[PDB]
Design a protein around this ligand. Structure first.
Ligand SMILES: Cc1cc2nc3c(=O)[nH]c(=O)nc-3n(C[C@H](O)[C@H](O)[C@H](O)COP(=O)(O)O)c2cc1C
Length: 390
């Protein structure tokens, strides 16, 4: 291979940690309310957590404790740098996307239970993270249609026995208000809505009142276009455009969720949320190349539209902490001044709408395109060098 997969040295791990710290500082300085550490969906930190991808025989692999080391080191570094109430963590225990193990690995629950335990231990010491964000076994692969890749053999409920702080849960909840109604009975549970927040800028209103949902268009999830980004209508706008039952999701039977805890306020980090419908991180690939710069034409509008319900928590699309952490030309970064100038405008707009914004800090590992990295003189990184993405 022109850019063969490289097993990180300890010094290189330390360098990533340094970059996470700087990226977090950059985000806060630009106006972000906090950061989310991406340790899910088969990216670098998840590659260390997972025994399929991590075959290391040093202190970063070979046991549950060792596999959790990198993730916990990033947590600790960020808590020290910017404060515990400005840091969250995302995990996907049952995910198989990007060649992670999922439930087929009998030790997977123990691996994640250990992480949760260590977070609770830190919480007892007065350093409780703002939240833990879980992808549900409802969606083990987000590129499969709702209802597909639903793992029936495991639950994330174990996390609640261990971690005693806020929990955001994401995965196929928009089409299932009956499930949400039950899950939000737990008073520290928030619900992330991904794909349907792409297509419904006023999703929160629609959830409250039980309105029909705009269909989403997969083909414009990742595209350099305003189309499928900023041109999805609100419900009132849709009706004025003459949209009928054909433009909305077919055979979906909405429920008004306004009478549930989903519409009770809750404090997350330093923010008083007015409801518990969260926008999870959603990569959209509108960032400019070269430079991984947030889009100057459409991004402010995209986030403004989705911030429209006051007191909404928004987690940004994954943002690279450094060039070496990247490998997708059209995903944004948070390492450079030219990037932060644009992020500042995005954060401004969200705050104008009385909503909140958390930057997801992203490192790709083996999910990167090695050819892009090679072009830029960068390594193709992962936990090991003898196991590869499918
Ligand atoms: C187009 C798209 C982009 C996504 N980008 C990210 C991302 O950048 N970071 C992340 O942690 N998850 C990302 N996800 C996963 C979602 O946050 C979410 O967990 C998943 O879509 C399931 O929720 P849903 O059924 O409500 O869409 C993405 C999903 C989609 C469909």
């Amino acid at each position: 291979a022109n850019n063969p997969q490289h097993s990180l040295t300890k010094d290189e791990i330390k360098q990533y940690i340094k970059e996470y710290v700087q990226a977090a500082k950059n985000s806060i300085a630009a106006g972000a309310d906090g950061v989310e550490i991406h340790s899910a969906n088969g990216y670098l930190l998840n590659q260390f957590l997972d025994p399929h991808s991590n075959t290391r025989t040093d202190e970063y692999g070979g046991s549950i404790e060792n596999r959790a080391r990198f993730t916990l080191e990033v947590v600790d570094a960020l808590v020290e740098a910017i404060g515990h109430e400005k840091v969250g963590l995302r995990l996907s225990p049952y995910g198989v996307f990007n060649s992670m193990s999922g439930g087929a690995e009998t030790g997977i629950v123990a691996q994640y239970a250990y992480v949760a335990g260590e977070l609770e231990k830190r919480a007892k010491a007065g350093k409780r993270l703002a939240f833990v964000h879980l992808v549900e076994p409802r969606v083990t692969n987000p590129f499969l249609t709702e209802g597909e890749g639903e793992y029936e053999g495991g639950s994330n409920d174990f996390v609640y026995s261990i971690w005693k702080g806020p929990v955001i849960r994401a995965g196929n909840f928009a089409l299932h208000p009956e499930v949400v109604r039950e899950e939000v009975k737990d008073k520290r549970t928030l619900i992330g809505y991904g794909r349907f927040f792409i297509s419904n800028p006023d999703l929160v209103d629609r959830l409250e009142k039980g309105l029909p949902l705009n269909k989403y268009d997969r083909d414009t999830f990742y595209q350099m276009s305003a189309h499928g980004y900023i041109d999805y209508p609100t419900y009132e706008e849709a009706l004025k455009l003459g949209w009928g039952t054909s433009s909305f999701v077919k055979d979906f039977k909405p429920q008004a969720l306004g009478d549930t805890n989903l519409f009770k306020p809750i404090k997350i980090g330093n923010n008083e949320l007015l409801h518990r419908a969260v926008i999870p991180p959603l990569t959209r690939m509108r960032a400019l190349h070269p430079g991984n710069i947030p889009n100057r034409d459409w991004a402010v509008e995209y986030y403004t539209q989705r911030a429209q319900r006051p007191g909404t928590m928004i987690i940004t699309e994954g943002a690279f902490i450094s060039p070496q952490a990247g490998g997708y030309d059209n995903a944004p970064g948070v390492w450079s001044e030219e990037q932060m100038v644009e992020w500042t405008k995005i954060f401004n707009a969200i705050h104008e709408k009385k909503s909140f914004v958390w930057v997801q800090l992203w490192v790709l590992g083996w999910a990167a395109f090695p050819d892009n990295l090679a072009r830029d003189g960068l390594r193709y990184d992962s936990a090991s060098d003898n196991v590869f993405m499918d």
